[PDB]
Amino acid sequence: HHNKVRTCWNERPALAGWLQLPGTLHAEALARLDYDAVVIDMQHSPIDFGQVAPMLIAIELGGAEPFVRTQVNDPSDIMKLLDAGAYGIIAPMVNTRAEAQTLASALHYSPRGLRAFGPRRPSLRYGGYLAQASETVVGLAMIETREALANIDEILSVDGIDGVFIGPTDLALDLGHAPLVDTEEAEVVSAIAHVRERAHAAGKRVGIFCGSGGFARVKLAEGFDFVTAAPDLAMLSAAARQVIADARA
Amino acid sequence: HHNKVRTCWNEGRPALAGWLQLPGTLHAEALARLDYDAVVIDMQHSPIDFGQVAPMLIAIELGGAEPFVRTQVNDPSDIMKLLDAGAYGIIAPMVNTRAEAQTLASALHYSPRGLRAFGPRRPSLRYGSGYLAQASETVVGLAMIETREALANIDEILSVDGIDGVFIGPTDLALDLGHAPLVDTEEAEVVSAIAHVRERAHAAGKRVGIFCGSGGFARVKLAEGFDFVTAAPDLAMLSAAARQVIADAR
Amino acid sequence: HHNKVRTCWNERPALAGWLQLPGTLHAEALARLDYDAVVIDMQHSPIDFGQVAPMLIAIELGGAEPFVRTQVNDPSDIMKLLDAGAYGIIAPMVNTRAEAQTLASALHYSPRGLRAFGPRRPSLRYGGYLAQASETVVGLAMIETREALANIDEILSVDGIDGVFIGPTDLALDLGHAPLVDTEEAEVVSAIAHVRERAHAAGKRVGIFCGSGGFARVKLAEGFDFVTAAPDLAMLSAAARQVIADARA
Amino acid sequence: HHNKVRTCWNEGRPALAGWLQLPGTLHAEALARLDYDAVVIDMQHSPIDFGQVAPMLIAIELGGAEPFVRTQVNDPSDIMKLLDAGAYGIIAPMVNTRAEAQTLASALHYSPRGLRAFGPRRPSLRYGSGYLAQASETVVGLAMIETREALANIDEILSVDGIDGVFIGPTDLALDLGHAPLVDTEEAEVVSAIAHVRERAHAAGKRVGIFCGSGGFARVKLAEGFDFVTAAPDLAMLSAAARQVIADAR
Amino acid sequence: HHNKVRTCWNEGRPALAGWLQLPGTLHAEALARLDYDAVVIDMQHSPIDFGQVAPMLIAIELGGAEPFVRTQVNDPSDIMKLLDAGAYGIIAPMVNTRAEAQTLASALHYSPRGLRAFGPRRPSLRYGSGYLAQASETVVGLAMIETREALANIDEILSVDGIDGVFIGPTDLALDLGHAPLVDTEEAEVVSAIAHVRERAHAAGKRVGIFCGSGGFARVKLAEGFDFVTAAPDLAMLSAAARQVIADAR
Amino acid sequence: HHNKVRTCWNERPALAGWLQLPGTLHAEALARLDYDAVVIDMQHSPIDFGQVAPMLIAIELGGAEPFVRTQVNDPSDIMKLLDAGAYGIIAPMVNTRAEAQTLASALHYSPRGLRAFGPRRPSLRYGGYLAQASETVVGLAMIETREALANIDEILSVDGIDGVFIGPTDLALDLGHAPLVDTEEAEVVSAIAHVRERAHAAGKRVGIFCGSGGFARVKLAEGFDFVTAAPDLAMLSAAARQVIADARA
Ligand SMILES: [Mg+2]
Ligand SMILES: [Mg+2]
Ligand SMILES: [Mg+2]
Ligand SMILES: [Mg+2]
Ligand SMILES: [Mg+2]
Ligand SMILES: [Mg+2]
């Protein structure tokens, strides 16, 4: 009867999983670990709509909040995921206030936005739903370009979104650096600390994508509200590489 | 050109294999590209149906590993359809008798050596029109030893000509011996039974394999002379990796 | 060799089904009932493209006209559904004449629109096709916002569309009311009667989404050209609730 | 924590279950959230293959009902894969003999009580590491009685320890008795046979269930003391609901 | 209204059928709309699982041809599920004995003539409430002859009342006779065996069919009096068509 | 370790296949023939994202370059296909320089474009990837409208795209002619020869869709850099029609 991430915030940060691999079984198993949410990546993965739909059900059963990082900031895409029981939306490449308004417009019924009414899965979870519907959903605009960085105060002024979510590898690449996992490039570190500073100054939430528990520990200690660690494919490949090395030793 | 596990065996060396309980092509290619000689797809304990296994075999083959399937059951017609989909290794669960081992062998070879139906959709693309002459050599076939019955019938199972050897299911074997179904068990009777099966396989000039839950245990099985070592299931490795990332983050 | 809904109109209103549930078996069974068309909802459902494709085939075999209510008024989405054998398109959230022109542009080959030529399934049904292709397809713009209501005459002036299709729950919500199934909110009833009046005055068709046979009876008697009743999920849940009550009595 | 049908049975009360012939997760969750104790997915007469059943079981479990499967056939390895996918009830069609009932029982219990293969992917997530000790109790198993053969062999079918009891297939039973395959039949011989099967089940201290086409007929079966009543198939309820909406609209 | 192959047979004429090894609905409808009386979906040698066959049957029926399935195996419960999905013809591979032919026949007919389970989801939509009375006539059933065993047992296979006749698997038959598994073979012993099977089928008042790789070979089989001729697999026709387009382009 | 089509060009034209039918088996078999690339059509087919993903893997294994003709010139669609191992993109209905810039922006990382970084499948193929990533991908803008024809020099001036790809049936239809397969309509033939002339004058590649080996032979002899022949459905239907005619003779 509550968004698990919003419950954290009403008390603390949320730690979230991150899925690049389609399917229900790992999604349920990771949801039952000490993750507050699990994010399904529809941008940089083979996950289409038909594949994401049962994964959202698997995450909720595991007892974590089902989040989707979308392919694009498209209102109608975002609406169909909310009606399929995505209760968190991370939209990539939100570069301007107008783009942040487009995201906010998808997350709220009229009068606060233009979300189309047909809440197939949320009406089953919440039963009462319409009266609390905006609170059931967390919305974060991705900051991952020099343009998004310049427009940070503009983007954070948008009511309807909870805050921003840093894509550090795309931010590093767009600033002319190596697209390093958990990049500590001094200019990129500066930009990230600036985004976190401006989000907290406007009374908004800030999140960040991490490639490691180590990096995620530091981001939590830095006061980020929403930390993801680490992609299922990345954790699985590293574990298999270590299992093989130990076998062949 | 060649079955990469048989190439290992021919050059005097064991094969190390991955083990997939998670459906999908991306991790199947990613793990195939690691220093695994083969990758086994589990169709027994997992949600992987035939529709989901077919593209996974392609993805493993592209990554450079030999695609294997541990079937739901020792059923000839299920096995033949997987061979024709480009499964180049078959591991059949719960092979308890000489008769069941012969049923497996029958699926793996064309007439006159078995009764495999001819329609090799994917193997004819890989091997070309010369496929029939070398078909038997392109496929590796292992009967699973997971029961007291199979342990008692090991010598007669090992006498069947059309299987390469046996593959220990150590959690089922531990359970059927009255012990905890723990992977990589130290239980003396289970350890004894596993050593017994390897010794009998090697005495009969056949291959022996074993399912492992860890790199450390796989290292020992490789040093003991196991021909085909699997380590470790994608879901188990992923789950353990996530619990550690969470522990480090919190 | 004809659009079953257009045949009704050339003689009478069309009564249509409405699917929120993916799959072929219920789609064929409902198509064989006394429905002129069956609408597949790709907005407020788990139905992706791969799932809709075989449902269109199942509806045609049942002998009803296959319709799709799309996720969004996107030309290229609409074109791919027409080439998969959708012979009716209902586009949601058509708020302006420009948006109604975008819908019209997808439904017609040049010179009447810009529909891309590759009619995989219609060429199999019609064999002759190009010469009649516009007549094989029914197009309706959804009116479900106060903006769409204000622009009704603008939207109805667009050649290329057959008419409009009322979304009464979204219209009620956007006008500041409860999103009630078959809403009789006096302001919403007024707006709907106005839309029907203006559609018939411009010589265009008007349709309406209904949640019940009762409401659909009244809309047919009011002279609506295209009436849908009722969602498969809604009919199934209500039937199961009554079966359980009778079992437990 | 517990199988909701067994909890009903333990607290002295019958179970009412839904019946799905339509694949997909949305209606499966919607019906599971109604006052049904279980929801049965039909894999015999429907287009539901293994790939389509797997997410449906998840969706029923989330809705709060016990996920059941009426299998295509009484096949041990098919049954074991469904158990490992989180099917917590099994209804096996066309169980005609004590031997076939024993084949069903064998699939449902780990050694030493049956021969179920150990790899409980979804049950180990629900039940945790204590699963092995309580596995048998987490699963409900019913043998279907749908033939004159099964009716003649009812007492020997009911003597098998590893099944909870029987589930009447009344359209097949009516047909095999030489009568119209009508659901909720008034045909005196079919009615007699159904009462006979319930009385024998209850005399043997086993459960009895029946497939129903209507709420009214289900009410009577519940009053007659049936332990497990299904009412009614999603496609039948949907079809009847659409014909009435159409009738009212026109 | 009627099975289009049986309508051919009743009007004194053979049936020509297509043969699909490629999953999907678009080519299945496109080929069904050509001058084919039936289209066979191959579930033995192809990547077509149950989930992929179900919409293909719909697509063939819409195109105007009778939907047929060559099953993976002669398994009654697999056959019954395909009948209930709107497969109106069944071709069972590797039918070697009278007993196996009786197993096929049992799947195809309701009690009292066979043991087919009653739940005809798609046939009841096509045929209506009068389906039970005419069910047997709506389905065509052929046992495949592809082994020396089946050739020796042809007369006893042909004595089974509940199958329409036999369907030659000529590549498997050539292989089992010790010859190259070439389609449309000129090998004298294979040609002789094929003529022998047709003559025995026709002497027993049953139908005979044959799988062909070419239009030219199909023409000859039609002139020889084959009742059911398939020509030629979608993948083979597509592959040959692409090699010619490439040859012409380069 | 190279794009097979780019290798042709660095030496010769590329001949490519064209798939309208979903599935891996024909995709692998056609890839192993003497095709340099195989194009999967997501515009005029039942192929959704979940269906295209394994087909790309099947084509690469066969040893041809996996290409996709997209439903639409949508950056985020194009990015998700590149991260799934599409190494050629043909975007339909590219009518203006701005539209050609939108295509170019999807194909290149910053600073040359805005491609989002998460190369799941290319990182597995190339291992080194980022340093050569633009060279691994071929991009072609479709010319199939009178507007695209008028703007040809504009479109060809865009850096980031390799060239253009002619859709002759849509070009014929938009110019007021019959949408004939391999059309030789004199005005359409003129327009095509003009597009080829202007592409080669700007030092860019030109490709063309063919319905036959005969037409494709002539286009190769005319100096087209990228020739497709012929759709799998079209080749299969024609072969089946000839097999039936020979059987019934
Ligand atoms: Mg990013
Ligand atoms: Mg085992
Ligand atoms: Mg609406
Ligand atoms: Mg029955
Ligand atoms: Mg054969
Ligand atoms: Mg075009």
Side-chain angles (χ1 to χ4, degrees), chain F residues 49-89:
Chain F
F49 189 85
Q51 287 182 110
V52 86
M55 298 178 65
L56 294 173
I57 304 163
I59 292 166
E60 191 184 333
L61 183 60
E65 208 59 40
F67 275 48
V68 179
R69 198 269 288 279
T70 67
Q71 161 189 325
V72 64
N73 182 24
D74 174 76
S76 68
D77 283 347
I78 286 160
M79 291 180 209
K80 194 183 189 163
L81 288 162
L82 302 172
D83 297 326
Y87 294 99
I89 300 294

Side-chain angles (χ1 to χ4, degrees), chain B residues 43 45 48 72 172 176, chain D residues 77-78 81 84 111 118 121:
Chain B
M43 297 196 63
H45 289 305
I48 307 180
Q72 174 181 315
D172 275 318
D176 202 46
Chain D
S77 72
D78 287 347
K81 193 174 177 174
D84 295 330
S111 178
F118 193 77
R121 292 298 82 86

Side-chain angles (χ1 to χ4, degrees), chain A residues 20 42-48 51 71-72 93 169-170 173-174 179 233, chain F residues 48-50 53 74 76-77 80 83 109-110 114-118 120 130:
Chain A
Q20 290 171 345
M42 290 184 83
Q43 190 180 21
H44 295 296
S45 80
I47 309 186
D48 75 351
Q51 287 182 110
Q71 161 189 325
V72 64
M93 295 294 177
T169 80
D170 271 328
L173 188 48
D174 202 53
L233 172 59
Chain F
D48 75 351
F49 189 85
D74 174 76
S76 68
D77 283 347
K80 194 183 189 163
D83 297 326
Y109 296 126
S110 190
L114 46 78
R115 183 181 169 191
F117 191 80
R120 290 299 85 77
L130 175 64

